[PDB]
Curated annotation (Swiss-Prot), chain B:
Binds to host ACE2. RBD also interacts with the N-linked glycan on 'Asn-90' of ACE2. Cleavage of S generates a polybasic C-terminal sequence on S1 that binds to host Neuropilin-1 (NRP1) and Neuropilin-2 (NRP2) receptors. Interacts with host integrin alpha-5/beta-1 (ITGA5:ITGB1) and with ACE2 in complex with integrin alpha-5/beta-1 (ITGA5:ITGB1). May interact via cytoplasmic c-terminus with M protein. May interact (via N-terminus) with host bilirubin and biliverdin, thereby preventing antibody binding to the SARS-CoV-2 spike NTD via an allosteric mechanism. The chain holds residues 159 to 207 of 1273 of the full protein. It comes from Severe acute respiratory syndrome coronavirus 2 (2019-nCoV). Attaches the virion to the cell membrane by interacting with host receptor, initiating the infection. The major receptor is host ACE2. When S2/S2' has been cleaved, binding to the receptor triggers direct fusion at the cell membrane. When S2/S2' has not been cleaved, binding to the receptor results in internalization of the virus by endocytosis using host TFRC and GRM2 and leading to fusion of the virion membrane with the host endosomal membrane. Alternatively, may use NRP1/NRP2 and integrin as entry receptors. This is Spike protein S1. Changing R23K: Partial loss of biliverdin affinity. Glycans are attached at N7. The gene is S.
Length: 49, 40
């Protein structure tokens, strides 16, 4: 699932990208850790869930 | 124009053909739907 992307999209529209969103405090354009974050996050789907 | 494309999602091919005038169109992309008008 898209980790985070700005605000509400319009109905029936997708979100595929590798844009490293700087949702955190600084406008970092790195990879992860703080600020600069990957736009997508994966679910922890296990049979134990 | 035909260039290095990528993971293509939609693809429709019309029937092949071989080819003073007006040709007026309309493009409408509303709620994810692309609408085309025409007149000759």
């Amino acid at each position: 699932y898209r980790l985070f992307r700005k605000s509400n999209l319009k109905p029936f529209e997708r979100d595929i990208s590798t844009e490293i969103y700087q949702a955190g405090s600084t406008p970092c354009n790195g990879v992860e850790g703080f600020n600069c974050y990957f736009p997508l996050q994966s679910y922890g789907f296990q049979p134990t869930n | 124009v035909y260039s290095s494309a990528n993971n293509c999602t939609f693809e429709y091919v019309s029937q092949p053909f071989l080819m003073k005038n007006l040709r007026e169109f309309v493009f409408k992309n509303i709620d994810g739907y692309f609408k085309i008008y025409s007149k000759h």
